Design a protein around this ligand. Structure first.
Ligand SMILES: *[C@@H]1O[C@H](CO)[C@@H](O[C@@H]2O[C@H](CO)[C@@H](O[C@@H]3O[C@H](CO)[C@@H](O)[C@H](O)[C@@H]3O)[C@H](O)[C@H]2NC(C)=O)[C@H](O)[C@H]1NC(C)=O
Ligand SMILES: *[C@@H]1O[C@H](CO)[C@@H](O[C@@H]2O[C@H](CO)[C@@H](O)[C@H](O)[C@H]2NC(C)=O)[C@H](O)[C@H]1NC(C)=O
Ligand SMILES: *[C@@H]1O[C@H](CO)[C@@H](O[C@@H]2O[C@H](CO)[C@@H](O)[C@H](O)[C@H]2NC(C)=O)[C@H](O)[C@H]1NC(C)=O
Ligand SMILES: *[C@@H]1O[C@H](CO)[C@@H](O[C@@H]2O[C@H](CO)[C@@H](O)[C@H](O)[C@H]2NC(C)=O)[C@H](O)[C@H]1NC(C)=O
Ligand SMILES: [NH3+][C@H]1C[C@H](O)[C@@H](O)[C@@H]1CO
Ligand SMILES: [Cl-]
Length: 627
């Protein structure tokens, strides 16, 4: 195909076109992006005196453990304590371990910060060392530190100890431990609460993020971060919905919540940590507010919304409010951030096409109130575009699609036929999730992708050329889900996978990165791809530099020749860079082969005419300079 490139831009490419969609799913938050290494660190939202309350916790030797509703809890928000008892006649090492989130990476190049709260519920003459550390799951101690404690300490007391491993572990099958001498400790009971183990964090943030994952997200050059969901916003009931104010302040004062993916959320990754991450990466938020529906099917009645609307106002005021004008904005100031954060976009609910009978009145009451308080914010509707008809008229819709790789290349013209009437579209969730048109959400045996493939990434890339061409009305687009803990998966495929030790960048990750890092501010119209065909392209240009980014998706099994004609330009560089992602159709980056498929960079000859053979199942970026 001959592709003629127009020198005259048709529109300015939004700064927000490519970004991330985050919720705590697959332990993407707890166990993932949030750097905390202990699972069930504070016994949040578990039933006392049950086995599930002790999840991730194990005795050392003859230790007696129970999670109790503490008669004098460490805080209002943390009613549960770990009751540790050493039997009469004990000796040696007695204590307990935390298995982490399916392991703990123990690296001698890291300093870890261990902390816990303890008290003796009954004053005693105990005198001895409390030792914390890291061991292999064989009991081989790799790091340890101790401090003197006394049975006369009946008031909650925090212990803060650094850990320095003497050796890196050969694998992640390691645990955190707390021990006392069994002879010195015989017959003693100690109550513990609010444990924590942190490695070094991204940007050395207090209560920050896991470095390799954070760096992987920053690597992709995202412009926005949509959060906190997704289904994880909604709750299963009104009472279990995400609430901003429960995620701010001291860890002692965050009660956690049962999330929407089968596990408890600590809310240690809370609103301020999200906003700090955005400051650290140059992302802007697309922030969702809860809109009167939860996943058990309950809509709030129109006459029940007012307190929930005010809570959404409170949440936005925490982000952007003048600290002199509201309690939430004053709280942001008090937590060390007097300056408002950026927030341009708020999403009203999540996937309210599941509650389209109530969304009209929910949308109406929420957006009337929020637009009056926040005249500069753009509010995004979550129902199917224009069905049902909403009032006020939404400025933006969030469009989600999970489909086959083929569907994505076949639907790259999805936005071309849309009216240009001031409405903008957010592709807030998309992914090629299955090769089975009949059972998209089924099993891997029935065609569900365990990981993105070259096929899925190239189909997505074709659809993304459509998003970029239509970026006069498409303002933002994010793959979902973003993150996967390979030991605790509720949804595949995912953009970035990891275990306790290392990260896997998917084929789809590299497509997302290639699109986002090679994006100018001018859209240059070109010869249209065949609507329904496997071969798609989109061309942008950086007005400041003349760097010109030709993105080519070949989502099919046939190599296809493209001849670019740039005769309209005064000058085209005599060379360009090629970046190409390609491989076998069903090839994946897996834990076993995490670098099977990676992009390759080369130099090609360019000018006003050049020819590129786009391989079967390839994503290609050619960068030239044009003036
Ligand atoms: C986060 O902030 C929300 C407010 O936006 C807090 O929710 C509010 O909590 C109060 C106190 O529990 C609720 O008032 C109570 O309602 C019950 C049931 O009708 C009543 O029996 C009590 O006498 C009292 O009036 C209020 O309804 C509730 N509001 C909403 C919108 O949920 C929430 O507690 C805060 N969370 C934390 C951890 O601080
Ligand atoms: C045990 O942990 C303590 C507490 O973190 C470590 O002592 C701290 O070390 C850092 C770095 O030198 C100092 O800046 C802190 O002021 C120290 N605090 C205290 C209370 O001493 C100590 O080095 C750790 N020991 C081992 C063997 O890992
Ligand atoms: C923008 O144009 C869209 C088409 O891209 C219009 O959508 C129609 O909206 C009415 C109700 O307002 C629906 O009953 C139709 O079914 C919609 N058409 C389609 C194809 O979905 C939309 O109303 C326009 N919006 C504005 C602000 O003018
Ligand atoms: C977490 O998941 C990883 C990756 O799937 C597991 O490690 C794999 O285990 C399988 C099945 O035993 C082996 O055949 C693979 O070779 C392992 N892969 C790698 C890269 O090591 C790991 O066992 C899981 N951890 C836990 C505690 O379940
Ligand atoms: N079904 C998806 C849509 C929903 O909002 C998310 O929580 C799910 C995984 O990305
Ligand atoms: Cl397919």
């Amino acid at each position: 195909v001959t592709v003629t490139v127009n020198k005259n831009p048709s529109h300015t490419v939004p700064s927000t076109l490519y970004g991330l969609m985050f919720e705590d799913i697959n332990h993407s938050g707890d166990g993932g992006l949030y750097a905390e290494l202990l699972q069930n660190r504070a016994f949040q939202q578990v039933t006392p005196n049950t086995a599930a309350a002790l999840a991730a916790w194990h005795p050392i030797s003859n230790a007696k453990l129970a999670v109790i509703q503490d008669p004098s809890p460490v805080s209002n928000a943390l009613p549960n304590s770990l009751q540790f008892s050493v039997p009469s006649g004990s000796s040696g090492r007695v204590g307990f371990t935390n298995e982490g989130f399916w392991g703990i990476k123990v690296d001698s190049t890291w300093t870890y910060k261990a902390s816990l709260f303890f008290r003796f519920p009954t004053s005693s003459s105990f005198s001895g060392a409390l030792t914390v550390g890291l061991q292999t799951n064989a009991g081989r101690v790799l790091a340890q530190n101790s401090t003197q404690i006394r049975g006369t300490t009946t008031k909650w007391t925090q212990i803060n100890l650094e850990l320095h491993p003497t050796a890196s572990a050969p694998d992640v099958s390691n645990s955190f431990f707390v021990t006392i001498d069994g002879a010195a400790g015989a017959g003693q009971t100690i109550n513990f609460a609010m444990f924590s183990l942190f490695p070094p964090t991204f940007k050395n943030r207090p209560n920050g993020l896991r470095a390799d994952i954070a760096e992987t997200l920053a690597e992709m050059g995202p412009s926005f971060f949509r959060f906190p969901g997704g289904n994880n916003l909604e709750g299963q009931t009104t009472a279990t919905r995400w609430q901003w104010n429960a995620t701010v302040g001291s860890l002692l004062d965050r009660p956690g919540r049962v999330g929407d993916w089968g596990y408890v959320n600590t809310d240690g990754l809370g609103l301020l940590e999200y906003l700090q991450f955005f400051e650290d990466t140059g992302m802007e938020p697309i922030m969702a507010v809860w809109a009167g529906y939860s996943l058990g099917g309950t809509s709030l009645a129109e006459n029940q919304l007012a307190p929930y609307i005010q809570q959404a106002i409170d949440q936005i005021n925490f982000v952007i409010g003048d600290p002199a004008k509201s309690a939430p904005a004053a709280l942001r100031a008090s937590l060390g951030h007097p300056e408002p954060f950026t927030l341009r976009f708020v999403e009203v609910g999540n996937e309210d096409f599941f509650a389209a009978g109530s969304y009209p009145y929910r949308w109406h009451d929420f957006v009337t109130a929020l637009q009056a308080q926040f005249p500069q914010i753009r509010f995004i509707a979550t129902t199917n575009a224009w069905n049902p008809v909403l009032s006020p008229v939404p400025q933006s819709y969030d469009v989600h699609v999970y489909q086959t790789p083929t569907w994505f290349y076949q639907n790259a013209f999805y936005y071309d036929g849309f009216q240009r009437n001031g409405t903008t579209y957010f592709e807030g969730e998309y992914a090629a999730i299955s090769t089975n048109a009949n059972d998209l959400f089924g099993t891997v045996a029935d065609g569900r992708l365990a990981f993105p493939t070259v096929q899925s990434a190239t189909g997505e890339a074709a659809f993304m050329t459509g998003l970029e061409r239509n970026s006069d009305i498409v303002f933002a687009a994010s793959y979902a889900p973003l993150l996967q803990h390979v030991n605790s998966t509720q949804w595949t495929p995912d953009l970035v996978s990891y275990d306790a030790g290392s990260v896997i960048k998917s084929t789809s990750f590299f497509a997302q990165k290639l699109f986002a890092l090679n994006k100018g501010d001018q859209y240059l119209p070109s010869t249209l791809p065949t609507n329904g065909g496997t071969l798609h392209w989109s061309i942008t240009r950086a007005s400041s530099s003349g760097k010109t980014f030709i993105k080519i998706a070949n989502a099919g099994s046939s190599a296809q020749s493209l001849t670019f004609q740039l005769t309209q330009f005064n000058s085209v560089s005599s060379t360009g860079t090629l970046q190409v992602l390609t491989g076998p159709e069903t090839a994946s980056n897996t834990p076993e082969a995490p670098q099977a498929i990676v992009p390759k960079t080369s130099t090609i000859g360019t000018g006003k005419t050049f020819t590129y053979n786009a391989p079967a199942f390839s994503v290609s970026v050619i960068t030239v300079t044009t003036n």
